[PDB]
Amino acid sequence: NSSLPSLRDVFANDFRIGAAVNPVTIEMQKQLLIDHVNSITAENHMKFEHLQPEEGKFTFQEADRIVDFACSHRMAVRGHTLVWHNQTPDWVFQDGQGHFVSRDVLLERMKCHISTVVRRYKGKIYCWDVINEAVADEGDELLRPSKWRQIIGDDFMEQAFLYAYEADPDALLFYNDYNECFPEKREKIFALVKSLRDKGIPIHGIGMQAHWSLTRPSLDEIRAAIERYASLGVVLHITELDVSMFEFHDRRTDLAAPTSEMIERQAERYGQIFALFKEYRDVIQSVTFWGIADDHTWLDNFPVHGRKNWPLLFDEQHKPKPAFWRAVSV
Ligand code: NA
Numbered sequence: 001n002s003s004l005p006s007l008r009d010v011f012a013n014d015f016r017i018g019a020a021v022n023p024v025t026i027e028m029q030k031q032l033l034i035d036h037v038n039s040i041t042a043e044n045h046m047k048f049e050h051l052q053p054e055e056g057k058f059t060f061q062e063a064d065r066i067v068d069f070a071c072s073h074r075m076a077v078r079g080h081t082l083v084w085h086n087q088t089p090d091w092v093f094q095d096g097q098g099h100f101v102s103r104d105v106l107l108e109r110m111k112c113h114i115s116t117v118v119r120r121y122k123g124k125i126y127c128w129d130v131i132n133e134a135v136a137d138e139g140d141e142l143l144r145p146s147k148w149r150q151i152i153g154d155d156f157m158e159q160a161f162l163y164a165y166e167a168d169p170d171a172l173l174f175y176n177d178y179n180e181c182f183p184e185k186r187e188k189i190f191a192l193v194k195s196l197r198d199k200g201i202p203i204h205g206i207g208m209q210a211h212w213s214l215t216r217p218s219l220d221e222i223r224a225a226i227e228r229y230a231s232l233g234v235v236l237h238i239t240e241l242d243v244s245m246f247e248f249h250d251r252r253t254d255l256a257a258p259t260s261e262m263i264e265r266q267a268e269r270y271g272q273i274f275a276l277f278k279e280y281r282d283v284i285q286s287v288t289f290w291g292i293a294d295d296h297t298w299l300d301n302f303p304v305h306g307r308k309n310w311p312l313l314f315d316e317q318h319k320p321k322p323a324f325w326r327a328v329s330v
Contacts (some may be wrong), residue, residue: 214269
């Protein structure tokens with residue numbers, strides 16, 4: 001690695017380079033992070049259930065460690081995530097009697113969470129995924145069901161963005177989602193963000209999770225989605241990038257190593273993707289991977305528990321893969 005290029009330096013004129021982390025992987029992958037990234041996201045410890053597990057009980061210790069690491073290495077931090085249909089405790093939606101709370105009460109609890117969390121990290125965290133994954137991933141409706149939406153109404157996203165803006169008006173506020181380049185879902189995401197901006201809501205950015213495979217989305221699809229979203233005037237971040245060795249239909253559990261063909265195609269795929277990101281450097285300002293090396297990835301257990309995946313630029317021994325060399329040479 002002594003003579004290896006540094007990802008953040010190669011892309012210094014193009015976008016930040018980030019990694020998702022937790023206190024354990026910061027220790028396990030510390031030198032790779034130090035050597036390559038200039039942005040960090042908490043993989044899990046800034047989600048609602050990890051910050052306010054019980055009402056009025058805030059547990060910032062893990063998030064604090066992650067921010068302390070970033071700040072001491074001059075890394076930016078993306079805050080992930082305030083309002084989501086997952087990893088939010090049941091207390092949030094319920095009264096003492098157990099019934100669902102009212103719209104007004106859920107808005108007070110949303111405001112209190114957002115205010116307390118965003119104000120704690122103001123001046124250290126420069127952007128927040130305020131709404132995560134509200135758009136439907138299947139069927140014809142615009143929006144996914146969620147208790148947030150059930151109890152407040154469809155203006156729950158408007159309110160979340162306004163509460164976060166009040167808590168830190170210097171932050172960039174994002175709508176973040178996956179399968180963001182499939183045309184039907186891209187059109188829903190575009191319509192939704194257009195409608196919020198058309199009302200003056202402080203949404204500044206779209207986060208493209210980019211939980212991609214070797215084949216999907218196509219490069220034409222990615223291009224079209226970047227152009228579509230940029231045409232709204234928002235900032236784009238690629239927020240959770242990984243390139244799975246398995247397509248969505250491939251639920252094999254048996255593979256103990258990637259084939260040479262998978263490794264080669266993944267290298268080609270990452271070179272193609274980075275070439276496209278560099279081409280859109282004027283609208284893409286950050287590319288975060290959902291990890292940094294193949295010794296830690298949520299894809300080992302999702303969508304199939306207990307297998308192994310190899311989605312990143314560095315292998316389990318933290319050495320560069322064929323994908324690294326193509327990514328850095330665009
Ligand atoms: Na840029």
